[PDB]
């Protein structure tokens, strides 16, 4: 026979989006062609991010966009998020941005267009720059979700800063034996 | 064991080494109006008989002897429990022993 071990024989990654959306599948039908038929890997990574799940393409906010676009060198470039460009209310002035996203929330659309910016979709991005040149590809904070505070080294183990699953935060709800130094032990 | 009744040790209030009258800690009288005591008593009152478990299998002969360390210096007079490794027979300050003698 052959003594190859078939555990990791199959790659796990996606080849099609799980969504049954039709506009997203048209964007996939376009970027399949562009990444197959160009030699710029912006197209490969942007179809790889069109495929993803909405917990893997987190919402990038407009404060991150303003900061990471005002970092020096990248003036009049095109910000590209594959997720959802959301408003961030704790920022006052907004510079002229040139952004491209699947879906921009309504107050962020109003904010950028009052600042004098321009919103694009991905079909217009492919017309405007097919190899994706002149673009800054950004992604949202992926471990910004509240779930990742429950992950890692478990609570009740030394040097583990993990939020434990408790039904209501209070005085009585798991503050006593693993936590105190008088009540039992402190981990 | 033999412990002298005066230890020159740390004093947490004065922040420095001071002499200490050393005696032995003994448990105070149990108050009828502590919270757990009157909780237990009210839960016992009625029917059901014994409610909280009665410990029967006492298994060790010793208890850890605890020294009460009063500061000598007259306005401070702080106290600490300083308990040492357990021992069956225990005395305070009697017969500082001497080597090289007949029996």
């Amino acid at each position: 026979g052959v003594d190859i071990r078939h555990n990791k024989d199959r790659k796990v990654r996606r080849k099609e989006p799980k969504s049954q959306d039709i506009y997203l599948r048209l964007l996939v039908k376009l970027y399949r062609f562009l990444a197959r038929r160009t030699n710029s890997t912006f197209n490969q990574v942007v179809l790889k991010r069109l495929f993803m799940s909405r917990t893997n393409r987190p919402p990038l906010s407009l404060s991150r966009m303003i900061r990471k676009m005002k970092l020096p060198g990248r003036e009049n470039k095109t910000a590209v998020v594959v997720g959802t460009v959301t408003d961030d209310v704790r920022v006052q002035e907004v510079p002229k941005l040139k952004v491209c996203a699947l879906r921009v929330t309504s107050r962020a659309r109003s904010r950028i267009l009052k600042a004098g910016g321009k919103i694009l979709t991905f079909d217009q991005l492919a017309l405007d720059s097919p190899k994706g040149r002149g673009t800054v590809l950004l992604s949202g904070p992926r471990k910004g979700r509240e779930v990742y505070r429950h992950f890692g080294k478990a609570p009740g183990t030394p040097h583990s800063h993990t939020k434990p699953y408790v039904r209501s935060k209070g005085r009585k709800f798991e503050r006593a034996r693993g936590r105190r130094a008088s009540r039992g032990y402190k981990n | 064991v033999n412990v002298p009744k005066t230890r020159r040790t740390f004093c947490k209030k004065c922040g420095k080494h001071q002499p200490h009258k050393v005696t032995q800690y003994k448990k105070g009288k149990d108050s009828l109006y502590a919270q757990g005591k009157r909780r237990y008593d009210r839960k016992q009152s009625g029917y059901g008989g014994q409610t909280k478990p009665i410990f029967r299998k006492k298994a060790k002969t010793t208890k850890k002897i605890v020294l009460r360390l009063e500061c000598v210096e007259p306005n401070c007079r702080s106290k600490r429990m300083l308990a040492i490794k357990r021992c069956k027979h225990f005395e305070l300050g009697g017969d500082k022993k001497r080597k090289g003698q007949v029996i």
Binding site: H150, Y165, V166, R167 | -
Partner: protein
């Protein structure tokens, strides 16, 4: 018998609750009952305010 990681919880189902479960299937019948009663009251006190005093 709790598994790896997850909120330990106290569901209050230790009583016999299936003999007493109030089910809301007469919600829209009760709303049309109330508003037909409200229309009858509002037209039987005819110029007075329907909301009462």
């Amino acid at each position: 018998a709790p598994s790896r990681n997850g909120m330990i919880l106290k569901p209050h189902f230790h009583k016999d609750w299936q003999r007493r479960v109030a089910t809301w299937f007469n919600q829209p019948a009760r709303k049309i009952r109330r508003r037909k009663a409200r229309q009858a009251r509002a037209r039987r006190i005819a110029p007075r305010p329907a909301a009462g005093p």
